[PDB]
């Protein structure tokens, strides 16, 4: 592989946006996890709600679903796509996201391969 581990999530998130397979927010994520249609989850390390973290971690663990940690919620939202692009090209309007669930993968072999390798290395 060539792409970095931490920067390889953008392709998957963009393709899930295009193919409409993203559950955004704690309520949608929890509902998808209960429906066990989820494939993987994305968690934001920077947060002020310990109960949020405990609920997401326990839901991921008790549904045998892999979990990923991200630095901050604003970057997570920028990856997710809840932003508007300015004339120059920067996202002045960003709304952060604390938890994301990927319901359908994008049909990309390279993007999925690195994440699967990372999950296998974690196990």
């Amino acid at each position: 592989g060539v792409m970095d581990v931490n920067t390889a999530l953008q392709e998957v998130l963009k393709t899930a946006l295009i193919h409409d397979g993203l559950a955004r927010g704690i309520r949608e994520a929890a509902k998808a996890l209960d429906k066990r249609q989820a494939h993987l989850c994305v968690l934001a390390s920077n947060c002020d709600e310990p109960m949020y973290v405990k609920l997401v971690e326990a839901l991921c663990a008790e549904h045998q679903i892999n979990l990923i940690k991200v630095d901050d919620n604003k970057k997570l939202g920028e990856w997710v796509g809840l932003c508007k692009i300015d004339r120059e090209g920067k996202p002045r309007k960003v709304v952060g996201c604390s938890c994301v669930v990927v319901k359908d993968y994008g049909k990309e072999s390279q993007a999925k391969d690195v994440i699967e390798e990372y999950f296998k290395c974690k196990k």
Binding site: I26, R27, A30, K31, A32, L33, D34, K35, R36, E49, M51, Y52, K54, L55, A58, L59, A61, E62
Partner: protein, 72 residues
């Protein structure tokens, strides 16, 4: 002819304002120290509302807001 106003009725019929509830997901689940999760709210017996669609714990009934199913 010209329109007359005649502006007098019940002072103001107010529009319903929806309640703002912060982090409504949390109260559906209870947590033990061991790491267990228990679902406080019942799950509807309907087709679509089966896993994540919880019911309403009214003082004398259970109510699913997605399909209007009601139980005692």
């Amino acid at each position: 002819k010209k329109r007359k106003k005649k502006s007098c009725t019940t002072p103001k019929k107010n529009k319903h304002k929806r309640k703002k509830v912060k982090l409504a997901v949390l109260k559906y689940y209870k947590v033990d120290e061991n790491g267990k999760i228990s679902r406080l709210r019942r799950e509807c017996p309907s087709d679509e509302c089966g896993a994540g669609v919880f019911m309403a714990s009214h003082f004398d009934r259970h109510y699913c807001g997605k399909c209007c199913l009601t139980y005692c």
